[PDB]
Each structure stands twice: as structure tokens, then as C-alpha cells.
Curated annotation (Swiss-Prot):
One of its GO terms (cellular component) is specific granule lumen. This is Glutaminyl-peptide cyclotransferase. Disulfide bonds join C107-C132. Belongs to the glutaminyl-peptide cyclotransferase family. It is found in: Secreted. Changing Q266L: Lowers activity by approximately 35%. Keywords: Acyltransferase, Disulfide bond, Glycoprotein, Metal-binding, Secreted, Signal, Transferase, Zinc. It comes from Homo sapiens (Human). Responsible for the biosynthesis of pyroglutamyl peptides. Has a bias against acidic and tryptophan residues adjacent to the N-terminal glutaminyl residue and a lack of importance of chain length after the second residue. Also catalyzes N-terminal pyroglutamate formation. May be involved in the N-terminal pyroglutamate formation of several amyloid-related plaque-forming peptides. GO terms for biological process: peptidyl-pyroglutamic acid biosynthetic process, using glutaminyl-peptide cyclotransferase; protein modification process. Changing D267 to A/E/L: Abolishes activity. The active site is at E163 (proton acceptor), Q210 (proton acceptor). Zn(2+) binds at D127, E164, H292.
Length: 323
């Protein structure tokens, strides 16, 4: 009986030096991300809408133009909703599908349904268009390094559909895509041909980004079994800061603060956490002031903060993968 699913417990990062850190900082472009990945997502995209379809096409297109060998899968299913049966489509983007272990980054690409109000449309800029754009920018910025993966560990990105409740949150009205994907991966043998391990045993760590893009975010350390990874984000932020690689940033107002949070926050990670998957939940506490209002738009996004977080995340990913 192989003990490979236990490898994640001991996996250590391969830390980048100063020179490598300046390279990562210089290799990501907040303006390119803004125009090529984010703006096309700032549209009404609740499940089943024409916008949902457009969002999904945009995401698959931006991934397909890259050199790395991404394998795209659309996981489509039906679920009961307050409005009756509906169709949903998760987008899964994987490097090295038969690779036993994967570091997983995720966000939801749907936008909460709201009828038009005084000609205003809800586009959920921080929730979660920016997290989506950040994942695409990461795939783009690290493309050359990720191409080299073509430790049986690789990378996977998941864009969940239907994270939002159609009405207000309830156990049955919310997290449609993730409750579905979690159960699916929990009952899918992995790697192919395996006798007793599933795709969930292969998830080294689930890094879920939500509500990112507002000013002064503060991310607490939610789980003891991922606490050492939270610490790495703290170390990275601190070193990028000391090297002068972040913009309009101070240690007093650092994003990753030494402090926990006992309460449960409902999000796409829940269905995975309840099946034993380690989670690093990158959601700030408190939530952006514009949370679930028509003001969660482009105008209220803090550009340098997103840029800083892009650098932190890309470094975290390269260190995890030893790239
Ligand atoms: Zn939301």
C-alpha cells in the first residue's frame, strides 16, 4: 500500500533567492491582466446566462493560447435550484492529468444573480472576477516555467460555477459546482487504474481565492493543517516588501496577518474540507465594503493591491512546485 497521499504532509518549498524574486515581480503585468483577462469578465454571468457562456469561453481561450500543456475539461451537470432544475459548468484546467499530486488554485466564475436595478448590473468585480483574472495572469506569467513540467506534483486550476445562492444563502441553494465537483473527485480513482485512492487524495492543497481586489485586505490563518503554508505567504510578502518589490505597501498594513478565525465561512472550499482536503482559504476578513452590492465594480478595485497579491501568489506557486 503506497503512502504517496501522505507526501503532502512533508512537502517543503524550494525557496527563491532575491534575484529570482525580482524576476517574478518584473514578469507579471497588472495592466496586461487588467485589459486581457479581467475586463472581459466584468459582465453579468450568473449560471445559465449568456454571460456565463461568454465567461467560460474567455477563460478557456486565454488558457489555450499558452505554451504549457493545459488540459481543459468542462464538468457539466444538473442540480435542483429554487427556480427548478438547472445546468452548471465547472471549468477544470490541469497540467499533467495523470500526475498523482496537484497543487490546486480555485475561484468561482459565476456572478450572483440580481435583477437589473436602476439600470445597474451586478458584475462582482472582487467576487470573483479579479480572482479569476489573477489565475489567468498566473498561468500566463509563469508559462515558460510551467512548460517545463510537460515529486510527481503538478498544477491545476478550478473555476467553479454556481458558488452563489440564487436567493440568499442556504445549504441547498449555494456551492452548486463545488459540492458537485468534490463528490465527483472523491469517487474518481486516481491516478488512473488506482485501487483505493481518489482525485481528492491527490489534492495536495486547495488554494481558494475570493473577494480579492478591494483596499487593505487582511487574510487570517483559518486552518491548522495549512498553517505552515499560510506562514510561507507571510514570509513571501515580507521578503517581497523588503526587496522593494511591492507597491504602496507597509508591514503595518500587511495582507497576511498573524491571527486565526474560529468561525466557518461558507465558500467553495467547504465540500472539499469536509472530505479531508487541506485548504488555504484566501478570503479577507472582514469582507470588502462593496460585498454583494452594485458597487462591487471596476471603479472600486485597488490596482496596486491586486498587483502585489499577484506577485505573492506566483512566488508561492513556483516555490511549491520547485520551479
Ligand atoms: Zn458573493
Amino acid at each position: 500500500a503506497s503512502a504517496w497521499p501522505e507526501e503532502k504532509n512533508y512537502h517543503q518549498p524550494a525557496i527563491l533567492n532575491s534575484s529570482a524574486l525580482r524576476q517574478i515581480a518584473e514578469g507579471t503585468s497588472i495592466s496586461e491582466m487588467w485589459q486581457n483577462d479581467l475586463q472581459p469578465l466584468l459582465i453579468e454571468r450568473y449560471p445559465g446566462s449568456p454571460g456565463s457562456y461568454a465567461a467560460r469561453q474567455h477563460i478557456m481561450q486565454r488558457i489555450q493560447r499558452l505554451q504549457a500543456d493545459w488540459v481543459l475539461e468542462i464538468d457539466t451537470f444538473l442540480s435542483q435550484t429554487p427556480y427548478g432544475y438547472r445546468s452548471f459548468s465547472n471549468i477544470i484546467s490541469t497540467l499533467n492529468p495523470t500526475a498523482k499530486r496537484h497543487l490546486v488554485l480555485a475561484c468561482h466564475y459565476d456572478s450572483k444573480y440580481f435583477s437589473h436595478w436602476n439600470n445597474r448590473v451586478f458584475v462582482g468585480a472582487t467576487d470573483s472576477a479579479v480572482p479569476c483574472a489573477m489565475m489567468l495572469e498566473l498561468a500566463r506569467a509563469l508559462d515558460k516555467k510551467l512548460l517545463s513540467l510537460k515529486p510527481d506534483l503538478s498544477l491545476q486550476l478550478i473555476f467553479f460555477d454556481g458558488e452563489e445562492a440564487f436567493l440568499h444563502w442556504s445549504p441547498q441553494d449555494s456551492l452548486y459546482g463545488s459540492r458537485h465537483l468534490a463528490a465527483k473527485m472523491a469517487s474518481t480513482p486516481h491516478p488512473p487504474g488506482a485501487r483505493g485512492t481518489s482525485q481528492l487524495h491527490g489534492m495536495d492543497l486547495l488554494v481558494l481565492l475570493q473577494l480579492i481586489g478591494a483596499p487593505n485586505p487582511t487574510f487570517p490563518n483559518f486552518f491548522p493543517n495549512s498553517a505552515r503554508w499560510f506562514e510561507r505567504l507571510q514570509a513571501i510578502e515580507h521578503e517581497l516588501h523588503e526587496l522593494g518589490l511591492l507597491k504602496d505597501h507597509s508591514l503595518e498594513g500587511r495582507y497576511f496577518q498573524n491571527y486565526s478565525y474560529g468561525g466557518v465561512i461558507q465558500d467553495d472550499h467547504i465540500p472539499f474540507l469536509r472530505r479531508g482536503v487541506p485548504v488555504l482559504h484566501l478570503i479577507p476578513s472582514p469582507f470588502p465594503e462593496v460585498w454583494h452590492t452594485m458597487d462591487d465594480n471596476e471603479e472600486n478595485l485597488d490596482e496596486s493591491t491586486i498587483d502585489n497579491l499577484n506577485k505573492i501568489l506566483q512566488v508561492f506557486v513556483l516555490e511549491y512546485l520547485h520551479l
